[PDB]
């Protein structure tokens, strides 16, 4: 027979189980390093509504070792989740969040309609309605200066043909599945060519 012979736990639990999450317009970036990562349990549970890896297999992820794992967590509507993909143009890609085409990442989305959606609506979540230029990949902008769609300058005040760059998200239970919010986590892997802080 063959004889193959947990401990440190990468903190995916904070990333996948939080009551409130950073808004898409400004998102916290978390680096996961120096821990043992098991992705088999996450896939087997299938608690998330969809488990998606564009260039990788979920069973392969636990066996594979990535020295640095980067988790980007934000709450966006289901239609926005379809827009967010590497190598795919999206309204989110144009403004608040940009994905590098060369980069390959796992995007995992689970419905947050039960908790995030409110009858009043949740204004804690926010998105960027418009931006003067496309944001750099893996970067966020906090500028509140009015977007100058009109030739005449906005001058930092609301005006005809002037639209505020950031618009507060509105999430309700009676909204459609695409309108309803989905929590999304994006994973970036350093993989080879780096000291192996994380071992599968």
């Amino acid at each position: 027979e063959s004889i193959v012979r947990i401990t440190n736990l990468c903190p995916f639990g904070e990333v996948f189980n939080a009551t409130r999450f950073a808004s898409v317009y400004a998102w916290n970036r978390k680096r996961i390093s120096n821990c043992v990562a098991d992705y088999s349990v996450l896939y087997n549970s299938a608690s998330f509504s969809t488990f998606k890896c564009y260039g990788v297999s979920p069973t392969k992820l636990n066996d594979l070792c990535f020295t640095n794992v980067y988790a980007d967590s934000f709450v966006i509507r289901g239609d926005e989740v379809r827009q967010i993909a590497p190598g795919q143009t999206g309204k989110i890609a144009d403004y608040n969040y940009k994905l590098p085409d060369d980069f390959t990442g796992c995007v995992i989305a689970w419905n947050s309609n039960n908790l995030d959606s409110k009858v009043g609506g949740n204004y804690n979540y926010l998105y960027r309605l418009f931006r003067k230029s496309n944001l750099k990949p893996f970067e966020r902008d906090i500028s509140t200066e009015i977007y100058q769609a009109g030739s005449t300058p906005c001058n930092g005040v609301e005006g005809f043909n002037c639209y505020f760059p950031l618009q507060s998200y509105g999430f309700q239970p009676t909204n459609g599945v695409g309108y309803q919010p989905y929590r999304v986590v994006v994973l970036s892997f350093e993989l080879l060519h780096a000291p192996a802080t994380v071992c599968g």
């Epitope: 309609n113 039960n114 959606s117 239970p173 599945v177």
Partner: antibody
């Protein structure tokens, strides 16, 4: 588009009357559904509810409806099982289809439901 | 919350029908667009008119137009028709089970 409902039937007060709402023409998942009574001489009183993602089953605190909404997305069918039936339950219930996120909104409804408890 | 409407109108064709939806407690929306308008044909299923009073479109004829102000919502029908009037409703939202308008009907003389 339209809704097919569970029509007129009579029970004594105190029971539980199942309703049913069939969906004709739309995707029953993507729409919050509901049941809303119009009784004569009564304004529409928003009663029964369901969300499009999970189960919300929201009812007005007022006097508890005790309604048992479910969804079958294979049937596209909403139910209203109204526990603790009473004579006042006699009314026109409307299983209604919510539109996409907005001011309300309820563009499409059932044809009206005869429900009588007396 | 709870709302009120202008009770009724009695009018003639080719006229404006102004209907208040008067909400107790909260006024409309923090996103500044809420309440609603609804019509129920007599002895018939209710039907949408306007959501957030500013809005909609096809299925709601152009004679339905208007806005709302704080609590009050204006259901405004210019060019009335004796065929087209039926009990009109609005909804609250964002607070309470969203309830509805107490209902309003515009009579037409002539």
């Amino acid at each position: 588009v339209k809704l097919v409902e569970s029509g007129g039937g009579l029970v004594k007060p105190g029971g539980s009357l199942r309703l049913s709402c069939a969906a004709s023409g739309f995707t029953f998942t993507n729409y919050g559904m509901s049941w809303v009574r119009q009784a004569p001489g009564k304004r529409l009183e928003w009663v029964a509810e369901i969300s499009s993602g999970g189960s919300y089953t929201y009812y007005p605190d007022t006097v508890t409806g005790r309604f048992t909404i479910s969804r079958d997305n294979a049937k596209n069918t909403l139910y209203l099982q109204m526990n603790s039936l009473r004579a006042e339950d006699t009314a026109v219930y409307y299983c209604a289809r919510f539109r996409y996120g907005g001011g309300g909104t309820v563009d499409y409804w059932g044809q009206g439901t005869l429900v009588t408890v007396s | 919350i709870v709302l009120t409407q202008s009770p009724t109108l009695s009018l003639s064709p080719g006229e404006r029908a102004t209907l208040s939806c008067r909400a107790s407690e909260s006024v409309d929306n923090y996103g500044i667009s809420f309440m609603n308008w609804f019509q129920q044909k007599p002895g018939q299923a209710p039907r949408l008119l306007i959501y957030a009073a500013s809005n909609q479109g096809s299925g709601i004829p152009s004679r339905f137009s208007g806005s709302g102000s704080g609590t009050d919502f204006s259901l405004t029908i210019s060019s009335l028709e004796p065929e087209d009037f039926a009990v009109y409703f609005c909804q609250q939202s964002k607070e309470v089970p969203r309830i509805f308008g107490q209902g309003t009907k515009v009579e037409i003389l002539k």
